[PDB]
Paper text:
The most recently discovered system of protein secretion is T9SS, also called Por secretion system, which operates exclusively in selected species within the Bacteroidetes phylum. T9SS is essential for the secretion of many proteinaceous virulence factors by P. gingivalis, and has, thus, attracted considerable attention as a possible target for pharmaceutical intervention to treat severe periodontal disease and restore homeostasis of the oral microbiome. Here, we discovered a new component of T9SS, PorZ, and found it loosely associated with the P. gingivalis cell surface in a manner independent of A-LPS anchorage. To sum up, the reported full molecular and functional characterization of PorZ, a novel essential surface component of T9SS, contributes to our understanding of protein secretion as part of host-microbiome interactions by dysbiotic members of the human oral cavity.
We produced PorZ without its predicted signal peptide (residues Q26-R776) by recombinant overexpression in Escherichia coli, and succeeded in crystallizing and solving its structure by single-wavelength anomalous diffraction with a selenomethionine derivative. The structure was refined with data to 2.9 Å resolution and consists of three domains. The first two are consecutive N-terminal seven-stranded β-propeller or circular-leaflet moieties (βD1: residues K39—M322; and βD2: G29—L34+Y335—T679 373839; PorZ residue numbering in superscript notation according to UP Q9S3Q8), each featuring a shallow cylinder or thick disk with an “entry side” and an “exit side”. These domains are succeeded by a C-terminal domain (CTD, V692—R776). The two propellers are offset from one another by a ~90° rotation about the intersection axis of the propellers’ planes. This causes the overall molecular structure to be reminiscent of an easy chair of approx. maximal dimensions 95 × 80 × 55 Å, with βD1 as the seat, βD2 the backrest, and CTD the backrest support. In the case of PorZ, which consists of two consecutive seven-fold propellers, the N-terminal segment of the polypeptide chain follows such a mechanism and forms strand βD2-VII-β4, while the remaining three strands of this blade are provided by the polypeptide chain after forming both propellers. Despite some general differences, in particular in loops, the architecture and strand connectivity is equivalent to that of the CTD of RgpB, which is the structural paradigm of a functional CTD required for T9SS secretion. Along this line, the crystal structure of PorZ revealed potential polyethylene glycol fragments bound at the hinge between βD1 and βD2 on their entry side, as well as on the exit surface of βD2.
Residue numbers in the entry: 29 to 776
């Protein structure tokens, strides 16, 4: 399939027991795990039939053999036994309901009670509809169902009782309960047999017979303990131990630390635990039992953070770490994808491999060597330069003896790192004098310099090194209140030890043909196309400098061309005021443009015409806010680093030699009068000639392949559908000199 998601499991924050499966949530990703049988588990995304992206909680209806999926966006999905999804978007669509936070997802029979920042919602699981919302727009701390259709609600430190047979959408229908306990301190409540338990913020746990509600202290857990409600019992998870409360107030203690969720069915003797950063584990509910670990065979990225990505030597290189003026503390993470499996270098791994006092945080740029895929460098914003070699971190460069200059004692912020054609590492440093540096990995020699016009600026962006040796670096920040963010082009002229022979041009602001400013505030992305043009993206859109190699030699300020699109009477600049985060260039010299808030665009050679655009609305794209791009020129897979994780789109730009056109097909075949939209040519390769002819041979439609698909309205010039018969699709790729003749029928 054309779209795919490369999502992370990692921190299991929730767990639910199913008669034959164990559903669990890790960072918003829902997934299944087999019980008695050795796994046969499953990962569930929007591609699997789900209606939304980040899972906020789950619960199972033993009676309806269905799972309720509640999303961070307020959306609801019902996963039936057959694996059929039913959407319940009433909460998400309610604009007035501004807080979607969920506190309790209680499933009683064939009803689900959702208590959150929106109120208390009654979900009809069998019929996917919400017949009522009590306390609408008020945070409801918890919910509990009792005998004789009675419902218990904890809101604003008050406990209310109400009969479901009355109009509980009316405040007068509920009765406020005065109980001997500090109700304002109650963080959770749940029913266990003939009792109701109340957990207090200070750790205490109160128990009360459901027929009297007279509270007495059951146990004294540690402060800020968590309560997990289950049909089998209640779990009081304190720091270092759990309290399992069951019928008749039997309490069992277990030394299980950092527990985020528990799953157990009414008649189960084993509970499934969510240990977060560890994952899943099963526990036999008996005094002398240990939580036996659950296996996670799923391999994915370390996290879903793709701040910066690069594609080299048939591998993806990604940096998760965050950038800002002082937006630090994000755990360091380097992710490498083989095309099948992941390799993750996290904060702890790197610190152990190198040893000592440094923090390995905010990894923000990658630089891969030419010829050695396992030899790459990583720039951390605050912790220095890192050398990776043969699957381990072999060195950390920061401070004295190194050219990695520190802006503060122990603070070296490294961004815009790249390698030259000669195998040297060029890079820039933030908030220091000798800004620009070079490292010879072979001779292990260092050289740093700067140009007064660019020296001591807060932060640079990314570096592109043109074939003639020119180095382009974008300016992300000078200082607090400075608009002097441009681009610096420079050539060291083979001697990184001197500036005396260098050529450089600092272009604070670019101009058009008429000598006016473009108007860009910041340059976020830069790309060299096949026509020797440096296409750059900014806060006000995209624009390219033609013959970029001659800028240092030219006798004028470089001219930037803002692409012009649309028909002759109605023209415009291709995406004005749209913040462009990344640019990648096709085998066809077409441009893949990532934007902050308006999805993904595919533009023509000169960026004049939009060839395609993908958003959350029109495509399986996870988020309209894309942070990075990377393209596998060999199999045509474009990696899309969205704010909500990694995705891949088959561009059809692949260098797949044999059987490349063996996959072309038309659907629907035959084309019946009840199918109005027309036909779709699929399994193509971008850049292909596609022509439709009658059995005679006269062409009726002709195009080039944009993506993997081409569409035909299947009608004549008169707008009425084309006559019955056998039509033919001739596909020719100019590159391989091979053709594909496929036929489809139009029937009465
Ligand atoms: C591993 As190679 C020498 O083909 O870049
Ligand atoms: Ca050398
Ligand atoms: Ca020089
Ligand atoms: Ca989102
Ligand atoms: Ca080809
Ligand atoms: Cl029903
Ligand atoms: Zn119903
Ligand atoms: Zn993160
Ligand atoms: Zn990048
Ligand atoms: Zn290689
Ligand atoms: Zn190597
Ligand atoms: Zn040297
Ligand atoms: Zn200068
Ligand atoms: Zn084109």
């Amino acid at each position: 399939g054309i779209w795919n998601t490369l999502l992370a499991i990692h921190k299991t924050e929730k767990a639910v027991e199913t008669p034959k499966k164990v559903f669990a949530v890790a960072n918003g990703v829902l997934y299944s795990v087999g019980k008695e049988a050795p796994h046969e588990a499953k990962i569930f995304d929007r591609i699997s039939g789900l209606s939304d992206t980040s899972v906020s909680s789950i619960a199972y209806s033993e009676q309806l053999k269905s799972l309720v999926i509640y999303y961070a966006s307020g959306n609801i999905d019902i996963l039936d036994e057959a694996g059929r999804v039913t959407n319940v978007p009433a909460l998400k669509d309610n604009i007035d309901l501004i807080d979607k936070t969920l506190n309790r997802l209680l499933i009683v029979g064939n009803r689900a009670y959702l208590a959150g920042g929106f109120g208390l919602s009654v979900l009809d699981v069998a019929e996917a509809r919400i017949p009522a919302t009590y306390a609408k727009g008020t945070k409801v701390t918890d919910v509990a169902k009792l005998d004789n259709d009675r419902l218990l609600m904890l809101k604003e430190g008050q406990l209310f009782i109400g009969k479901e047979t009355d109009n509980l959408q009316d405040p007068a229908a509920w009765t406020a309960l005065s109980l001997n306990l500090p109700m304002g301190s109650v963080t959770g409540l749940g029913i266990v047999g003939e009792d109701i338990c109340f957990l207090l913020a200070d750790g205490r746990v109160y128990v009360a017979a459901n027929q009297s509600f007279e509270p007495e202290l059951l146990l004294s857990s540690s402060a800020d303990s968590r309560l997990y409600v289950t049909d089998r019992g209640l779990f009081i998870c304190a720091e270092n131990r759990i309290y399992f409360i069951e019928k008749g107030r039997k309490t069992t203690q277990f030394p299980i630390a950092d527990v985020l969720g528990v799953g157990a069915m009414n008649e189960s003797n084993t509970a499934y635990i969510a240990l977060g950063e560890e994952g899943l584990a099963s526990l036999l509910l008996a005094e002398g039992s240990t939580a036996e670990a659950m296996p996670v065979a799923f391999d994915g990225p370390g996290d879903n953070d793709f701040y910066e990505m690069r594609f080299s030597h048939g591998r993806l290189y990604a940096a998760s770490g965050l950038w800002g003026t002082n937006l630090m503390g994000h755990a360091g993470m380097v992710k490498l994808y083989d095309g099948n499996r992941w390799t993750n270098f996290d904060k702890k791994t790197v610190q152990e491999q190198l040893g000592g006092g440094f923090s390995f945080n905010d990894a923000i740029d990658i630089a891969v060597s030419n010829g050695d895929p396992d030899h790459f460098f990583v720039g951390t914003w605050g912790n220095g330069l890192f050398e990776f070699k043969d699957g381990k971190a072999i060195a950390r460069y920061s401070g004295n003896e190194t050219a990695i200059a520190e802006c503060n004692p122990g603070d070296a912020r490294v961004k815009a790192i790249a390698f030259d054609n000669k195998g040297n590492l060029w890079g820039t440093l933030g908030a220091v004098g000798k800004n620009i540096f070079m490292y010879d990995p072979q001779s292990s020699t260092w050289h740093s310099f700067s140009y007064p016009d660019v020296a001591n600026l807060a932060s640079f962006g990314n570096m592109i090194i043109l074939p003639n040796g020119d180095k382009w670096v974008n300016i992300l920040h000078r200082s607090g209140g400075s608009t002097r963010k441009g681009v610096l082009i420079f050539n060291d002229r083979g001697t990184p030890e001197t500036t005396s022979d260098d050529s450089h041009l600092y272009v604070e602001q670019f101009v058009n043909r008429l000598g006016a400013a473009i108007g860009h505030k910041t340059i976020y992305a830069m790309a060299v196309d096949h026509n020797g043009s440096v296409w750059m993206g900014s806060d006000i859109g995209i624009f390219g400098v033609y013959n970029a190699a001659g800028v240092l030699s030219s006798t004028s300020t470089p001219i930037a061309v803002r692409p012009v699109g649309g028909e002759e009477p109605n023209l415009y600049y291709v995406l004005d005021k749209v913040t462009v985060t990344d640019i990648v260039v096709d085998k066809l010299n077409h441009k893949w443009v990532a934007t902050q808030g308006t999805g993904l665009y595919l533009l023509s050679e000169d960026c004049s015409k939009i060839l395609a655009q993908f958003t959350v609305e029109n495509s399986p794209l996870l988020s309209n806010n894309i942070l990075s791009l990377a393209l596998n020129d060999d199999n045509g897979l474009l990696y899309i680093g969205t704010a909500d994780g990694l995705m891949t789109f088959q561009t059809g730009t692949g260098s797949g030699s044999a059987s490349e056109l063996d996959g072309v097909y038309v659907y629907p075949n035959p084309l019946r009068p009840e199918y109005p939209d027309g036909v779709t040519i699929a399994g193509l390769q971008a850049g292909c000639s596609v022509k439709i002819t009658d059995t005679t041979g006269r062409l009726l439609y002709q195009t080039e392949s944009v993506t993997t698909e081409v569409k035909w309205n299947a009608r004549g010039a008169d707008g009425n559908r084309v006559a019955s018969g056998v039509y033919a699709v001739a596909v020719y790729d100019p590159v391989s000199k091979k053709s594909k003749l496929i036929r489809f029928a139009v029937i009465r």
